[PDB]
Design an enzyme around this catalytic site. Structure first.
Site, mmCIF file in Angstrom:
data_model
loop_
_atom_site.group_PDB
_atom_site.id
_atom_site.type_symbol
_atom_site.label_atom_id
_atom_site.label_comp_id
_atom_site.label_asym_id
_atom_site.label_seq_id
_atom_site.Cartn_x
_atom_site.Cartn_y
_atom_site.Cartn_z
ATOM 1 N N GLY A 57 0.807 -1.207 0.000
ATOM 2 C CA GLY A 57 0.000 0.000 0.000
ATOM 3 C C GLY A 57 0.846 1.266 0.000
ATOM 4 O O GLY A 57 2.037 1.240 -0.296
ATOM 5 N N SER A 86 5.487 -5.638 0.750
ATOM 6 C CA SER A 86 5.720 -4.203 0.925
ATOM 7 C C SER A 86 5.493 -3.766 2.360
ATOM 8 O O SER A 86 6.168 -4.229 3.282
ATOM 9 C CB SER A 86 4.809 -3.318 0.060
ATOM 10 N N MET A 87 4.549 -2.837 2.523
ATOM 11 C CA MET A 87 4.209 -2.286 3.830
ATOM 12 C C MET A 87 3.790 -3.368 4.817
ATOM 13 O O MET A 87 4.099 -3.281 6.009
ATOM 14 C CB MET A 87 3.108 -1.238 3.678
ATOM 15 N N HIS A 111 10.641 -5.145 -0.957
ATOM 16 C CA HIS A 111 11.225 -4.430 -2.091
ATOM 17 C C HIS A 111 11.289 -2.934 -1.786
ATOM 18 O O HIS A 111 10.680 -2.444 -0.835
ATOM 19 C CB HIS A 111 10.464 -4.719 -3.398
ATOM 20 N N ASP A 160 12.304 -7.267 -6.160
ATOM 21 C CA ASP A 160 11.382 -8.106 -5.393
ATOM 22 C C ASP A 160 12.068 -9.354 -4.849
ATOM 23 O O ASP A 160 12.694 -10.113 -5.591
ATOM 24 C CB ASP A 160 10.180 -8.512 -6.248
HETATM 25 B B1 LIG Z 1 4.809 -1.833 -1.287
HETATM 26 O O1 LIG Z 1 4.969 -2.608 -2.371
HETATM 27 O O2 LIG Z 1 3.537 -1.703 -0.864
HETATM 28 C C1 LIG Z 1 5.608 -0.466 -1.272
HETATM 29 C C2 LIG Z 1 5.979 -0.025 0.149
HETATM 30 C C3 LIG Z 1 7.341 -0.565 0.636
HETATM 31 C C4 LIG Z 1 8.525 0.215 0.065
HETATM 32 C C5 LIG Z 1 7.401 -0.560 2.167
HETATM 33 N N1 LIG Z 1 4.707 0.577 -1.769
HETATM 34 C C6 LIG Z 1 5.151 1.809 -2.453
HETATM 35 O O3 LIG Z 1 6.293 2.012 -2.642
HETATM 36 C C7 LIG Z 1 4.131 2.852 -2.929
HETATM 37 C C8 LIG Z 1 3.502 2.421 -4.261
HETATM 38 C C9 LIG Z 1 2.239 3.256 -4.564
HETATM 39 C C10 LIG Z 1 2.327 4.363 -5.398
HETATM 40 C C11 LIG Z 1 1.190 5.122 -5.667
HETATM 41 C C12 LIG Z 1 -0.026 4.774 -5.099
HETATM 42 C C13 LIG Z 1 -0.111 3.672 -4.260
HETATM 43 C C14 LIG Z 1 1.022 2.911 -3.988
HETATM 44 N N2 LIG Z 1 4.753 4.145 -3.109
HETATM 45 C C15 LIG Z 1 4.159 5.345 -2.514
HETATM 46 O O4 LIG Z 1 3.177 5.255 -1.869
HETATM 47 C C16 LIG Z 1 4.823 6.723 -2.725
HETATM 48 C C17 LIG Z 1 4.532 7.783 -1.879
HETATM 49 N N3 LIG Z 1 5.091 8.972 -2.043
HETATM 50 C C18 LIG Z 1 5.938 9.143 -3.046
HETATM 51 C C19 LIG Z 1 6.230 8.093 -3.907
HETATM 52 N N4 LIG Z 1 5.668 6.907 -3.731
#
Ligand SMILES: *[B]([O])([O])[C]([C][C]([C])[C])[N]C(=O)[C]([C]C1=[C][C]=[C][C]=[C]1)[N]C(=O)C1=[C]N=[C][C]=N1
Ligand SMILES: *[B]([O])([O])[C]([C][C]([C])[C])[N]C(=O)[C]([C]C1=[C][C]=[C][C]=[C]1)[N]C(=O)C1=[C]N=[C][C]=N1
Ligand SMILES: *[B]([O])([O])[C]([C][C]([C])[C])[N]C(=O)[C]([C]C1=[C][C]=[C][C]=[C]1)[N]C(=O)C1=[C]N=[C][C]=N1
Ligand SMILES: *[B]([O])([O])[C]([C][C]([C])[C])[N]C(=O)[C]([C]C1=[C][C]=[C][C]=[C]1)[N]C(=O)C1=[C]N=[C][C]=N1
Ligand SMILES: *[B]([O])([O])[C]([C][C]([C])[C])[N]C(=O)[C]([C]C1=[C][C]=[C][C]=[C]1)[N]C(=O)C1=[C]N=[C][C]=N1
Ligand SMILES: *[B]([O])([O])[C]([C][C]([C])[C])[N]C(=O)[C]([C]C1=[C][C]=[C][C]=[C]1)[N]C(=O)C1=[C]N=[C][C]=N1
Ligand SMILES: *[B]([O])([O])[C]([C][C]([C])[C])[N]C(=O)[C]([C]C1=[C][C]=[C][C]=[C]1)[N]C(=O)C1=[C]N=[C][C]=N1
Ligand SMILES: *[B]([O])([O])[C]([C][C]([C])[C])[N]C(=O)[C]([C]C1=[C][C]=[C][C]=[C]1)[N]C(=O)C1=[C]N=[C][C]=N1
Ligand SMILES: *[B]([O])([O])[C]([C][C]([C])[C])[N]C(=O)[C]([C]C1=[C][C]=[C][C]=[C]1)[N]C(=O)C1=[C]N=[C][C]=N1
Lengths: 181, 181, 181, 181, 181, 181, 181, 181, 181
Positions: A57, A86-87, A111, A160
């Site tokens: 998310g 991810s999160m 990732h 990943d």
């Molecule tokens: B994971 O795959 O959920 C990952 C989180 C991990 C690094 C702990 N998610 C993201 O990197 C998200 C992807 C996303 C982008 C846009 C809408 C929804 C989800 N990135 C961000 O949320 C994000 C926030 N601010 C700037 C750039 N990216």
């Protein structure tokens, strides 16, 4: 949604069980924080159980939950059911040490963050600087809770990286892989 | 498109007139380069006239045309008709010194490049680095042909900057504002 | 498209100039091969000039053109105008040694191939095996024409790698960066 | 939404906790004002806690909330959870002095307002005059609560400016960055 | 389109008749300028006839045509057939004095320019400044060719102002309302 | 499509070269058969060259071409350029023995047919019986021209099977892998 | 919508507070009138508070509310929160004299009505006559409650006219601009 | 949904009956796990009945349910009603030995997992490796509960394999095919 | 849905009346089975009344209901109201002998199953084999309850076969056609 504090998730709330299910967005984060603050106000001593089945998310929504978990005084047991990606894998790792659990067949994935940028070259330079900062931030969090060095974290999260629960335990994302209680 | 070397643009080609009209993309750039190479092969001494009415376009397509204009031996007269914005203002400035013209009521606009980026944080860092390099590249080009310093260029192009032909002449984008021949 | 062997691209064909412009697909590849075979039949001794302005395209369509370039007896001069990315950078590198050219402001980009897979796990395993083979194939081609080792190629193409013409010359993708003839 | 004054947000309302979550529009603003007026009527002495996780929103909807916060007699504690961008960062700064909080990993972003205009040149001149007035209005608000000069505000908000909580504290947007209570 | 220099518009071109029909955009403007430059090259002495039936169009495209009409040495007779609105009424007024014609039942309409703006408040302030400049520019043009004062022009063009040919003649947009030759 | 019997494919037709490019459907099949019958009528002795770059296509359209190739008296040389998948690999194998060619980097793929069925259970039983018959038909064709046994064919075509030109030669789909003429 | 006469708007209704929020249409008008008639029946002496945050809406829906406000015996206090544009500014002005309030940062906007017409010329003449009558009607209302002359009203409302609360007070739309109670 | 613990599924919950109906996704899995944990907390000794009518679903959602079924102490009776395909057949087989039931006319189907992959060749290689691991994982599960060897499992699941209840019993997916209780 | 165990279908449930209305899918089947199991648990002796008005539906969903009807001990009276087509006619025939009813003007329709198949020829052969098995299964069911031979069943169901209630009684689908009780 079935009825038994009446509907099934409210009935679990009385058990101090919070469900983090599906994609993590602001609404989901809002709900989980509300429940964590409620459960802290009911008592600051009793543990809380967080059951995690999530594909991932929004970073700031996830960091909101993560900060709430650190801020409240209660110990938090985390349970990986099905997947933590991810999160979801970060929140799983953020549970109280010795209290982070997986079932036998769950998948963990870690990732780096992803996003986008638009506008003038100056606007793009700002937005790229911001996602770079967030990347470093997240890598520090994972290093803290898993005890891996930053170098290991960076190498592992470039692409990943799927893990079995035993691999995740070896990595330091979780403590126990339990078959039966 | 009317017929008079038969259709009206081909009939102008015999006059060594190339029309750069509307958005500049790969197809448009392909055509203009083809005509410039044809007109060079017909003779390397006779001037070519480039009539520019463009809102702008793709950077690499524009840089393709710009390099072709520099590479061929012919002197090139540039004519601003109606507007020259983004790449159109750059191509106007790239004409042979003393041979860059505007009509009285044309508008010139200069600004920095714009774009987008997507993917992982590493992919975004690469793409932001690339648009930054292109920005510096373009600012060097404008400094060369207008004789303004880089500092002046950077200040002027941070935001959209519209110019009258007299202002453009003062800036160094063009040489002559002609009412009648 | 203007008229002067009548339309402007046909008029260039008489000069033994082939234009490879925009995305490379089967149709584009079909056309270029047809022109190369025609120009070989007109004479096997006279050089052919290939002008490349391409963002990339389909691997097998590009490999079709690449094999045709190797198979015909004519020397082929390649010209980077504007950009050569993906297949366009590979075709640029495939020109006759000492005959690979860029204009001053062109951008070169190299990267690994991308694609997709669908179906049952067995179908996915086959398709992943196929794109891996194609990756190794392409890396061998780049190593051959640039004289870089496979290790260097693999390191450089893991992510998008943009090059200036001088960098490309240093890499071995091209021989000459020409301002004027 | 789970049930424990029955559903979880109503249950928090009894704690004098108002949640400002997601984009701020008229509906969201309407709700928050209603809750603030209710909580004032229950008592004008007891503090209110505003938890902010917002990407931003409509200026007049945000200014509605901001005026309500100033008008009621209660002290208001503001909490940045996850992010405070645009209006969310302004509402965070509008909390009672010494009562403005962030968690450790929240992001703050400040920038100038954005909008659109349409119609005849006279209609466009009116609409541009209106967004300019709103810009000056907002900059005065930020100067008041952060104690920065107008010049500093103008410089900082020309482009998107992301802040860590410590940076925000230095700027004057908030007072305390708390890990644990 | 029927065939009789073969198709009907090309056949009229031999008569030095240029048709300005429908909305005026860059493509339309490009064509008309090409024909005007061709007809000047065929001779600089013989008049050109411009037949106008247009609802209006893009300002810079229209100003391109207008500048071309002023720049070429030929006298230009303008004919209003059906309607001349916005740019069409301006081009009608730009014909050689004593050579501007309407048929009995044509409608003329004059009004101020319209457009849009988007982005940050700074971007909007720039775009509003630009459409204001264009408005003043156009009002100067109309004052020049109609001999009305600026005050009269401003008053007349604030809203849509429809004219009969006799009213237009009184205004100074045209010279002759002809029933039969 | 460029002009040199005037357009480039017609100019190749005079060389007795037929291009089978892209997906094979009824229209494509119609064209190829027409050209093969024309080239036979021009002479029944001179070879025909078929250049194949195809992802595949409709079975009956492909079988139409295949039958035409067998029926005409001319020897047919087949050339794999880029890829031959599905029907394209079958048509490649159907060339005159000793006259089936690949370039070095072409990919060959063979697989069983795919389709659909709808309606009542009786209609579905008929349609399934029909695609089974077509499968057996095609496997007989491949066995004939490659000299592999039916068992080998069935095993190889159950799933997608990609081949290099050397592998294809070993399989019996083609005779020569040529680098230079 | 949270629960405390149970949900938050019903809980405010017990305070004799009516919320007029967002666009004003028939449904919104229906609700507000129902609440005003209910609150009158509960007592004709106690004041009612109308909180207005509206971009505007349908004329007849707004006039419905306006007539209801005049017809009931209760004094009505009006509160501008955030914005009052079109009908919202009219309803704000319609509050009981000395009882019309704004917060410090609200925006007021007044303008003439807008609409459309379709059909035969006779149908269009009727519809234009109707919107003209409505315009005169509304201008009389504004003149009555603000005490400005019709001439002033007509001049002010020809175009969009934004006001600060102090300007609105000067105009006569409201009585008090309150910071704190 | 009818009302008789009030609605019909809640009324069955009091009987310790859990319904697994339709496609299995995260939401469905979340619900079933919640009910299983609730029913365990009500007593760890009393059996639970799981009624399965499912076409299949997401692997990790299904594995979540499967792990929950193994982890809780209660014996679980599984009932195939109508169909059990993919995950539904796996969950049916996961019931307590001697407690796995089908009705006479239910259909069982088993097959390998399916999915997709996208991105760079390196990303595709990772994703293909992951679905291969999941395939092996699932085959181990089926081997455990049916007592078939891995070889038998692999052979049976390569393609869709439909079973009658008696065939399923022979296979070891279930124990009893019951007509009447 | 009106309220009188409160809403009208729940109020009928207390009468042991189950309504099978509209298309039969998994959700509908799930509901009906739940009600049948509830009504059995309330008592295994008292009859249940099933009122059927259905155009048909999914085979496995219908077979689920059919098996439930056979499995529970209660006698089941079936009532055709309006229509019973496909699965609806099968469920009508599955009622307890002597307890299957139609109203005077209901229509019964019987026919063979319909479906689809996709994929490779091997996948299609499997899916066609499966719908053939289901066809034979269903024909056995109809033969059992109507007492017609398989040959009669096959002949009757090849095409859509509409029946009056008297015809249906003659066929053996139902026992009584009742006008009044
Ligand atoms: B994971 O795959 O959920 C990952 C989180 C991990 C690094 C702990 N998610 C993201 O990197 C998200 C992807 C996303 C982008 C846009 C809408 C929804 C989800 N990135 C961000 O949320 C994000 C926030 N601010 C700037 C750039 N990216
Ligand atoms: B101008 O306004 O036309 C301007 C050129 C100027 C700086 C000389 N154009 C651009 O900056 C374009 C905008 C664009 C983006 C995408 C599609 C079409 C046009 N930018 C680019 O072309 C570009 C190229 N590579 C990377 C990033 N941006
Ligand atoms: B480049 O960026 O153009 C790159 C070629 C480079 C490696 C020499 N292109 C590709 O990798 C393409 C991308 C693409 C996918 C699908 C449609 C069009 C383009 N990959 C392929 O063509 C491909 C072919 N077969 C299998 C997998 N991918
Ligand atoms: B922020 O990013 O949320 C920012 C507020 C900041 C300056 C305190 N928001 C805006 O500037 C909004 C953007 C927007 C436009 C249109 C719809 C929704 C949001 N601007 C306005 O609301 C606005 C209002 N009136 C005129 C112009 N712009
Ligand atoms: B007329 O009605 O044609 C009028 C011209 C008149 C003032 C001589 N046209 C315009 O004002 C056009 C309207 C338009 C907008 C957008 C697309 C097409 C047409 N205005 C402009 O072209 C324009 C140009 N630059 C800035 C703002 N507006
Ligand atoms: B190949 O991949 O092109 C393959 C041919 C191979 C077996 C020599 N193609 C097919 O099998 C096609 C796929 C297709 C289906 C529908 C539209 C277009 C293409 N199958 C058929 O054409 C077909 C024809 N009749 C019945 C069933 N399938
Ligand atoms: B305002 O901006 O809300 C304004 C009211 C002001 C004059 C007190 N609104 C209108 O003028 C509305 C605009 C509208 C049109 C169509 C749908 C919704 C809103 N005009 C009318 O409602 C209207 C009614 N009858 C005839 C013509 N116009
Ligand atoms: B079955 O048919 O339901 C089957 C499960 C069986 C092997 C026990 N389902 C799958 O294989 C699913 C199909 C699917 C894909 C995408 C969305 C929904 C369903 N596969 C997966 O869920 C999956 C998960 N991770 C990676 C790849 N595939
Ligand atoms: B009937 O008309 O409702 C009929 C049932 C009859 C034979 C007792 N229905 C079907 O045959 C359905 C049609 C259908 C197809 C797809 C979606 C919904 C309905 N057939 C099937 O359900 C089916 C199931 N498995 C395989 C093939 N067809």
């Amino acid at each position: 949604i079935p009825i038994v504090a009446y509907d099934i998730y409210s009935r679990l709330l009385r058990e101090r069980i919070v469900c983090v299910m599906g994609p993590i967005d602001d609404s989901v984060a809002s709900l989980v924080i509300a429940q964590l603050l409620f459960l802290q106000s009911e008592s600051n001593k009793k543990p809380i159980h967080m059951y995690i089945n999530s594909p991932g998310g929004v970073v700031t929504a996830g960091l909101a939950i993560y900060d709430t978990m650190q801020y409240i005084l209660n110990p938090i047991c985390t349970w990986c059911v099905g997947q933590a990606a991810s999160m979801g894998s970060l929140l799983l790792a953020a549970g109280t040490p010795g209290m982070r659990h997986s079932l036998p067949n769950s998948r963990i994935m870690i990732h780096q963050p992803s996003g986008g940028a638009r506008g003038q070259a100056t606007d793009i330079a700002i937005q790229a600087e911001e996602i770079m900062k967030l990347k470093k931030q997240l890598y520090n969090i994972y290093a803290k809770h898993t005890k891996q060095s930053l170098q290991v974290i960076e190498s592992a999260m470039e692409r990943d990286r799927y893990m079995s629960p035993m691999e995740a335990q070896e990595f330091g994302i979780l403590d126990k892989v339990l078959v039966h209680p």
